[PDB]
């Protein structure tokens, strides 16, 4: 609350990743690390995990406390992309494939 920093610990998927009814994807994550409250590191990269694509819809997502749960809405581009949550080796890398309805 006083100092806003990026979470350094591990996240885990806490619900099936799924499509909304308005062309977006929702991901729920449990924060298992420390230093909370802290900001959830998250971005979407291309099929090569290189360039940043799509965008995050939710306002700056936070992990409020240890073992807290956070809902995140984002907008992957069409085709293959990777939702990367957290930093370092423990980072979650989730393959998403978006088709045209």
């Amino acid at each position: 609350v006083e100092f806003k920093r990026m979470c350094s610990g591990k996240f885990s998927i806490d619900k099936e990743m799924a499509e909304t009814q308005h062309g977006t994807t929702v991901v729920k994550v449990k924060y298992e690390g420390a230093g909370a409250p802290c900001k959830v590191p998250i971005e979407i990269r291309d099929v090569n995990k290189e360039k940043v694509v799509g965008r995050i819809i939710s306002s700056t997502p936070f992990a409020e406390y240890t073992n807290s749960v956070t809902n995140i809405e984002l907008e992957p581009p069409f085709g293959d992309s990777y939702i990367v949550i957290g930093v370092g080796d423990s980072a979650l890398t989730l393959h998403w494939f978006r088709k045209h309805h």
Partner: antibody
Amino acid sequence: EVQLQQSGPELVKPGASVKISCKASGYTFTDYNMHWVKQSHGKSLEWVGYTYPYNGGIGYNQKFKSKATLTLDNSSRTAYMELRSLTSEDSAVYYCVRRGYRYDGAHFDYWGQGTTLTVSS
Amino acid sequence: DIKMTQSPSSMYASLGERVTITCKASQGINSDLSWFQQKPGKSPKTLIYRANRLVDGVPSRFSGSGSGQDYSLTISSLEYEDMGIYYCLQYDEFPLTFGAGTKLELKR
């Protein structure tokens, strides 16, 4: 029509392992996750885990993390659940059940016929 | 883990009557809730998902309602084939958890 066909009954000794299959048909396989569920005789249903068709999206109920290994084969539209270090407590009926993660998907609407596992010496 | 509590554990009814059974989550599950019916030695058959979406092919006498922590399944007019055990499932958060079931039996 949607169909989930599981492999037949299994009878093994304690310490052994088994691998139950669940072949799907009648829908776009990659648009659905496959969950596995345990039901001991006379007991409630219990979540084992699930598999998501892309990049080994794997979820384990922490209870089964040292017991089960879930896998997928998208090309054959077949899900597998492998149980190891078996004991009598593993004896139960196991089901596969699908869950659509797309905007137009249905949730847990079709189950497999179930697969009976009996562990004993 | 989210605890799912079904009430009642068992109950009796007569053909033609409305039956309502309930399922309460220990925390809000945002309508990520499904209902199933299961007969002895058979696999579960799904009635409802997303708390109120009727599964294609399932008779219209079954309906689902509720929100937050509380959910109800209602059979408007009980029929003979409706006997069995009904289960609820939350899939809002891992691990998925099931209620202990409600056994529905026939009066006489």
